[PDB]
Amino acid sequence: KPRIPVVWIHGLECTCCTESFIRSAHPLAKDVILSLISLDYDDTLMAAAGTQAEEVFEDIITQYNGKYILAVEGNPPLGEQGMFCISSGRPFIEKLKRAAAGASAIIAWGTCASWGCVQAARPNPTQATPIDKVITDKPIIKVPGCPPIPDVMSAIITYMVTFDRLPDVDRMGRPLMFYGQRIHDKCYRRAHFDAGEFVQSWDDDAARKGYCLYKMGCKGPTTYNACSSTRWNDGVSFPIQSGHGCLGCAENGFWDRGSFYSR
Template sequence: MATVDGSVYHALIARGVSRRSFLKFSAAMAGALMLPAAYGPRIANALSTAKRLPVIWLEGQDCAGNTEAFLRASHPTVAEIILDTLSVDYHETIMAAAGRQAEDARKATMKAFPNGYLVVVEGSIPIAEGGIYCTIGGRTFEDTVKEVCAGAKAVIAVGSCAFDGGLPAAKGGPTGAVGVSQVVPKATVVNMPGCPMNVQNLTAAIVHFLTFGSLPATDSLGRPLFAYGQLIHDQCERRAHFERGEFVTAWGDDASRKGWCLYKMGCKGPETYANCPTARFNDGTSWPVKAGHGCVGCTMPSFWDQMSPFYGRLSTTPGFGSDVTADQVGLGIVATVAGLTALHAGGSYVRHKRDAAAPPPPAEAVEAGTATGGTQA
């Protein structure tokens, strides 16, 4: 395999990555992207010659959780190293430069790579009152995002805040926070929501870009299908307990110690599209439901408001009257998923009772059949 100065492969070899590990990584990326195994060699070949990608990473109203995910340092894997090999020329949190020097670095990258850099945006963009709630170098963040994204090959919005405003956009937020797509509607933006996003998914999206010259296919909300195409509920290791009507009903109860389903504790897995059960976090060690906490639906639109209460079932379904927004109507249409799930939950109890001659379901079983709301791609 040829090595080319400045290529991703060259950078990996320089970091001590063996060819075997590199090929294994390429095959794993094909799997992560839900491509046939035959794409593994093609990915390896593309990464062998792909030049390191200049990246401008912008941060607006955020907690830097996605930066933390990006920087995690323990047990470096090929996936982590490949992120290191990106040429991150501007990243406010990690760059040594500050003030004018930092802004100069951003401008220099934009000039050196006209239409040739990748932009990652983390955090929401406040647009209320002329965008004054977030300014960098004397300019509004909104202005900076517009300027930088205008010259980008592609834009990746990481985390829920860059997706649709996230926490700063939750009810009562005063800053008029919105996501990247709302500020640069004509840009090629891929949304990777999550609080934070899973860095394995970011790696896969970048590998896709390096291999095919484009970001992966997305759903109607701009989320890559390979990572956001399936319900959490359909991939969950506790699903068998859901089917059998075996639910945790109090934190720390016997059912919780047995690892039963968290549906009655408010788990939003049935309403949430993400690959957390398979991609997992912390080097693939675990994910929230495996650790005993229900999914709160952090990859879904307006999740702080729409998925509340986090520890209870959703109680209302948006209607279709004149008092609801287009977004809410969209959520209402897809609430069928949640409705079907609720029926499914009730049905599970019926089956459980019939098949196992179990005692009648407790009142909460009926309550499970009232769950509504939810969102979908």
């Protein structure tokens, strides 16, 4: 019984979203690849290189035209005629447009593909631009975070395969299931926020009791994600549980909202 074809491409990026995917605990990434989808193109993992990789790309997008899902990690730069990111001797944006044209839907993994992330922070030297400003005629599901949580990535994949539909989304294209509530609306340190019980300097008596990180710059009050409920790495921790405020990493423009240590 055939598995759904998937093409995964990479623009300007750090590769954190790919690394997050392979951390999945349930289902294991091994079982996603062997049993749930057909991962037919991915430069990080595939055997073929060069001309042999170009032949796989061409063959899949032609044979499965209109029927494959496109996963995108990273983003296209508009500066230097697109040659800040070069794929088979040509601008990455040309490969993005060819892959998007044949796709039935697009998953924009991470803050890079969704919004811009670190390369788009001031002064944006390469004119890095999110996917939805270039591809304007296809369904795009945004899954932001730097990177998104591993078991959130795999839950979104399993939902689509099991239910044979895209997740319902908010006004920004984020899945309601994981991005409908703020970090601060499900934070286990909220009792301390409500009581005015705050860390004032690192490793003070308040820090050693797990008090709230608002005065240390926590951006949980303005950030939508699942970190305070689902948590990270098979439920082991999240940024606030280990003593650092949220940076805001799931939100558009988080790098340029002032210092991470300003309230």
